[PDB]
Ligand binder design. Structure first.
Ligand SMILES: [Ca+2]
Ligand code: NA
Lengths: 64, 281
C-alpha cells in the first residue's frame, strides 16, 4: 500500500492530485500553503498537499 | 448516561476525580479551530479568534478544536463523555480556519492572547515541519510567564534515526506528546525523536464534535489534551505549583514504556503526578 509520494515533490499540484487519485482513488485531498500550521489528527483517507507560492508541491505528500 | 472514554481512565484521571479534583478554576486555552460552545457537554468560559475571515471562536467549522476541548474538559454530568479536567475554565482560542490550517502569525497571536489573559495551560494540537524564531519566542514567553504549554508531537511516524517531532512540540519549552493505544503501544503514525517527552492515549479517542455529536478520532492531537487536562487536574490539587513543577510532576511519574526515542518517558499517570513525592510506576 503506497502511503507516501516523495517522487511528487517539485511537481505541479495538478499532477500530484492525478497521481495520488490513481493510487488511492478514495483520497480526500486538501491543498494548503507550505509553511502553515495544521491540525494533528490522523485521517487514513486524507492526503494533504503542501504547495509553494507557484502551486508546486513543496513537501512529501503522505496519508494522514 | 455518561461514558468515560478509555483514555481518561488510562491516565488515571478518575483517581484525581475521586479525591475531589477536576481542574476547577484552572484556565486552559485550546489553541485550535474554535470550540462549539453550543455543545451541551462543554462549557466554554471565553476566547478570541485570530483567524481574519472567521471571527467567532465559538463556531468550530472544522470539528477538531471541539474534539480536543472535550478531551480536556467535557462536563461531568449524565451525558456524553467525561473530560480529564471536567471543571476546567475552557477558552476557545481560534487560530485555525475551517480547513484545519493557520498562518504562523495567527498561532502566535493566539499564544499572546493566552498570556495576556492569564491562561494557566495552553494546548496546541497542531504543528508544522519548520519552526520560526517568532514562534519559538511566543512559546518561550508563555513558559517564562508561568503557562504550562503542551503540544502534539506530530503524526510523521518514523524516518530511520531522524527526529520527526514537529513544531512547536519540538521546542524545549513545550511538552511534546506522542500517541499510544489502549495497550500502551505507540501508534504507528506517532512522531519520534529525542524531543518526544511523554505519551498519552491517541487512538480511537471518543470526544465531543460540533452539533451535539460525539466521535472517535486518532492523532497526537488527541494525545496532547490528555496531558493538558492532566496539568489542569494537578494545578487544581496544587494551585501554587509552577508550570516547571507541573511539567516535572508529569515527566517524573510516567509509566515507562519502550525506548525514549519512540516513547519518551512513557505514559502519563496523573494520579502519581499529583502526589507530593514522584516516581515512575
Ligand atoms: Ca458528560
Ligand atoms: Na518540546
Amino acid at each position: 500500500m503506497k502511503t507516501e509520494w516523495p517522487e511528487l515533490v517539485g511537481k505541479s499540484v495538478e499532477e500530484a492530485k492525478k497521481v495520488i487519485l490513481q493510487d488511492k482513488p478514495a483520497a480526500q485531498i486538501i491543498v494548503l500553503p507550505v509553511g502553515t500550521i495544521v491540525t494533528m489528527e490522523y485521517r487514513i483517507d486524507r492526503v494533504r498537499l503542501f504547495v509553494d507560492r507557484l502551486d508546486n508541491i513543496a513537501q512529501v505528500p503522505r496519508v494522514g | 448516561a455518561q461514558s468515560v472514554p478509555y483514555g481518561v481512565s488510562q491516565i488515571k484521571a478518575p483517581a484525581l476525580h475521586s479525591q475531589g479534583y477536576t481542574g476547577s478554576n484552572v484556565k486552559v486555552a485550546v489553541i485550535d479551530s474554535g470550540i462549539d460552545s453550543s455543545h451541551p457537554d462543554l462549557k466554554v468560559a471565553g476566547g478570541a479568534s485570530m483567524v481574519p475571515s472567521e471571527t467567532n471562536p465559538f463556531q468550530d467549522n472544522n470539528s477538531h478544536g471541539t474534539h480536543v476541548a472535550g478531551t480536556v474538559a467535557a462536563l461531568n454530568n449524565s451525558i456524553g463523555v467525561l473530560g480529564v479536567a471536567p471543571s476546567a475554565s475552557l477558552y476557545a482560542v481560534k487560530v485555525l480556519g475551517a480547513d484545519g490550517s493557520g498562518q504562523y502569525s495567527w498561532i502566535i497571536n493566539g499564544i499572546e492572547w493566552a498570556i495576556a489573559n492569564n491562561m494557566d495551560v495552553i494546548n496546541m494540537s497542531l504543528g508544522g515541519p519548520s519552526g520560526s524564531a517568532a514562534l519559538k519566542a511566543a512559546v518561550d514567553k508563555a513558559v517564562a510567564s508561568g503557562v504550562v504549554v503542551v503540544a502534539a508531537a506530530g503524526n510523521e511516524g518514523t524516518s530511520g534515526s531522524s527526529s520527526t517531532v514537529g513544531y512547536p512540540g519540538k521546542y524545549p519549552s513545550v511538552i511534546a506528546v506522542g500517541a499510544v493505544d489502549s495497550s500502551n503501544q505507540r501508534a504507528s503514525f506517532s512522531s519520534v525523536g529525542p524531543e518526544l517527552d511523554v505519551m498519552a492515549p491517541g487512538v480511537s479517542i471518543q470526544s465531543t464534535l460540533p452539533g451535539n455529536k460525539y466521535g472517535a478520532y486518532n492523532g497526537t492531537s488527541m494525545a496532547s489534551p490528555h496531558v493538558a487536562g492532566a496539568a489542569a487536574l494537578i494545578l487544581s490539587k496544587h494551585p501554587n505549583w509552577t508550570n516547571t513543577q507541573v511539567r516535572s510532576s508529569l515527566e517524573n511519574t510516567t509509566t515507562k514504556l519502550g525506548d525514549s526515542f519512540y516513547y519518551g518517558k512513557g505514559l502519563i499517570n496523573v494520579q502519581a503526578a499529583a502526589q507530593h513525592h514522584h516516581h515512575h510506576h
